[PDB]
RNA sequence: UUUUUUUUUUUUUU
RNA sequence: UUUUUUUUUUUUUU
């Protein structure tokens, strides 16, 4: 009945620091899990989940994050073939709940996989692999992803990690211009400013490894032994630098 | 049938200023009420409506005004707790009618006890302590969301009135530009054109009696016995005249 | 079975003159009729619609143009008068079929009585009388709303008619800025390319007479005996001139 | 359970290139196909199919591409007409599924016919031949469509071709900024990145031989025997050069 | 915002 | 586009 007196009595019990603490881990941002992804993957999948996943990271890759879109473009057999991908894994477009699957979310889960499948796909990319030859020369295949991030060892010397992912970034800035199009008017900083929280999330997540990751950016010829970028990965951290 | 001659004769009818005027009033935009948000925690809570808005608070504090958008990210657990108060309290997003609920109009309404939340939550959100730290020394935690407006007793002289208000200010300056990215390349005066109005409104509200609310702005350490601004409040409030 | 064959035979036959414009008028956009407003007024209010019409001209002057919007804000009495009003005459927002009413259309249609309630509404209008005031001193009122444009007599001497134009179009102006916020950061030049043809539409349409539409610019202090504007409306034409 | 070690073994296993390059093929884009117009055509209008299409390139090119929107503002004929072709035809907005007709489709799709019609229905498209006569004198009234490219011969003698490409974009550069309003504040070349990817794609379609297209070119008097540009073509593709 | 943004390739229809 | 645009006033929640 007396609302001012309701609002001062309320205002009166004390903060408890532990209580709400408490509530605001309870109510958190809940970041990129990858076991999440492949968990959901086998539940919906069985037996026939990585076959499935291939042919995902293959969507995903040339057709993009809209399942229900692409399919509109699409023939006879790719339109069967996305509908009971849709149907199986109740796919779903953008950023929905973690509960939920999306052809982006299983490319970046499976990133050692996909980043496999880019030097196939070069040609077929939103940015190819020869428009990227023509910014820095022998450009990495490898790097021409978002999912890549996934693959960066963060415990990498800091000079060598920065090359990596000023090379990688190189990518990043001609990509999102090309599928987001109202940074195609906007400076380097600005475009960076879209891509470096979620390529510094996988970079810092715990699925796979420091060891695993750089025994795969090894085995792509991404790194030497002792971790030191290769000369293609220089030049595309340096193109970065002087990109606009 | 004759149309011209309809509206030729409606047209000459004098006009009744008094019908007119009731008319406007009845009609009349519907202010923000803190009574009817409290009214509505009531009804929908019964005993636990206190519990409830210490929740609502955290929510509305760390994670937004978004509910179904906010659970999206969300632990299994906080998506329960979510989902039961979206339920129980009939809980929408943005700005709907004075008849429901909001996250913000809960935090707005028991501005009191947000603001001691404040201390506590500083890091967790969208521009921190820490960050306001950096702009001026030791910047005062209570002030760093819009419902601090609300605390504000228009009553206080004017230049003490001022220095609380310009201080509070450079928090709703960074604020802003966080959650509304349109106006990230906006000036100081064009961003201060979106929260003036709210700010203003909250400040001379009926809500809270001039002296209750200098007995906040005390207890909260923002003013003396004679309601003159401490060092931090007058720090703030120079800061704010060369923010960019 | 032999598309191109199909197309080609197509092609063949010649495009008729007659039958092809014959289709363009049948096809054309249909402008705006004040005699369609009132018929469905009519219609759905019977005895009911002048009292109604008023009622309805308050709420597009003072409210605006989304009925199920502004009754998010307003007074349970309010909000019972609209709910009302949007049942009896099916009232809908924006720009619909021109089967449907509109509080925008309502006032546009009964121009002679939504100008005269310009006068008593001047302080509750998205621009004030005030601030018109300020821009050039004794604005005329009647001025007021895009719907003035319906009480103009094109067959005025030409000098006169842009004067009165140019003054109007100083509320336009400030108007669609005000209603219209991405207008806010255009030249005077781009606003105006917004409300130049809505404006040239009315003026021009045949609803009410060119005499009678004189006779009233005269009863309202607009036009003098010979059509010569008054001195408010050549100082409102002159600020426009200059206007930013 | 272990979905680090699932993660491991899926990107152990080799790229089967002919794999993915199946599923690449599979999964492409399917482009605009005339055909298929005609084909879906056939089968909702029968005997009908070909009177329909005259009223439904009426429709594209004085109406524009969304049926159901250009409807609301429309007389009773013709919206009973729009009515029964969206009935029939199950005509969509935009750009949907290939299995389904838009009025910008069947106007592509017969491509011979809508050139023609331009003749007639000049001073009724969206920009007029009479405003095409200011920027070059006796614009060719033929290329005053998009789905001009799709008679386009890309075989003709480089120059020629060049000629006849530059002439109709000049046509091109002021409808997309009509139809388009937020290409009104970019540059020409801003402008061409939007027409020229879809103009070449109906110039290098596989729909109507380069001898049947070419017959058409020297019919509409764009090119005389030998493919050489009439005057008229040369002077817009002059003007084109010049154009802001 | 925190693995997001998924654009073009007969579109864009003011 | 052709009587449209209906913003603020505890909002904007990235």
Redesign the interface.
Known sequence: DN??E???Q??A???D?N???Q??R??????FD??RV??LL?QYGGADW?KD???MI??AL??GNKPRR??????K??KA??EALINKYKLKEG????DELTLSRVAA?????TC??L???SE?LPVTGTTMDGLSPAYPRHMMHPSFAGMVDPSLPGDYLRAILDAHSLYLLQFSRVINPNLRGRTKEEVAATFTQPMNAAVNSN???HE?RRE?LKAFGLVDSNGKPSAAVMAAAQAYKTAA
């Not at 950023?95 to 973690?98: A, L, T």
Request: aromatic fraction near 12%.
């Open positions: 609302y001012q309701l609002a001062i309320f205002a019990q004390a903060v620091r209580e709400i603490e509530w605001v309870e109510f958190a941002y809940q970041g990858a076991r492949i968990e086998k990585e996943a291939k042919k293959v969507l040339t057709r692409m399919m509109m473009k699409m023939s057999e790719g073939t996305v950023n929905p709940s973690r889960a499976l990133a050692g996989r496999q499948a030097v196939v796909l077929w699925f796979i490894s695993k795969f």
